[PDB]
Design a protein around this ligand. Structure first.
Ligand SMILES: O=c1oc2c(c(O)c1[C@H](c1cccc(NS(=O)(=O)c3ccccc3)c1)C1CC1)CCCCCC2
Lengths: 99, 99
């Protein structure tokens, strides 16, 4: 579809059988989500934001559906203010900027 | 124009007669710039994100040139790690997100 930016670009995602809400963020390289349980083993990571660094748990090859589109890649879990969909997954669904 | 997201979406902007490079961010409500001097009165504020809150100085009605287009709007000045162009200026040059 086409999304204008007069209000926050929020979308529904289906992950692990449940529906959740997330923000489409072109400035982020990675996808970051709130504290939840995921299958498999994990590895550690530090990412910096506008207010400092945070430690996160990294999970690879997770399936996640965004507005009917399917993607499979890395997802990070940690203390974030909202769920974030970043460039790593925006490229899989073929999303672009237009002005 | 159409921009892909295989790499970071960086652009050059002109403010206060100074050249700067910035990141197009659909997730940010406002525009936040690194510590610099601007003319006028300003009000202190707190904005939060990944990692916590930061204190900034808010200036209103600042003119900015972004990739050939003029725009007017609020600008927040403070210790952000990188220059960010948010939704309040992006809407003014009619940028949309498409997939
Ligand atoms: O915190 C972040 O860290 C980074 C990026 C990013 O897009 C954010 C976001 C952000 C940005 C600007 C202002 C606000 N604060 S706000 O008031 O505009 C806001 C508050 C809550 C929710 C959304 C927006 C929040 C966070 C919401 C996700 C990516 C770009 C590069 C910078 C470093 C990483």
């Amino acid at each position: 579809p086409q999304i204008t930016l007069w209000q926050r670009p929020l979308v529904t995602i289906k992950i692990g059988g449940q529906l959740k809400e997330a923000l489409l963020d072109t400035g982020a390289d990675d996808t970051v989500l709130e504290e939840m349980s995921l299958p498999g083993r994990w590895k550690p990571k530090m990412i910096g934001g506008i207010g400092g660094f945070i430690k996160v748990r990294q999970y690879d090859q997770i399936l996640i559906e965004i507005c009917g589109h399917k993607a499979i890649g890395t997802v990070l879990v940690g203390p974030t203010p909202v769920n974030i969909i970043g460039r790593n997954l925006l490229t899989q669904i073929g999303c672009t900027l237009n002005f």
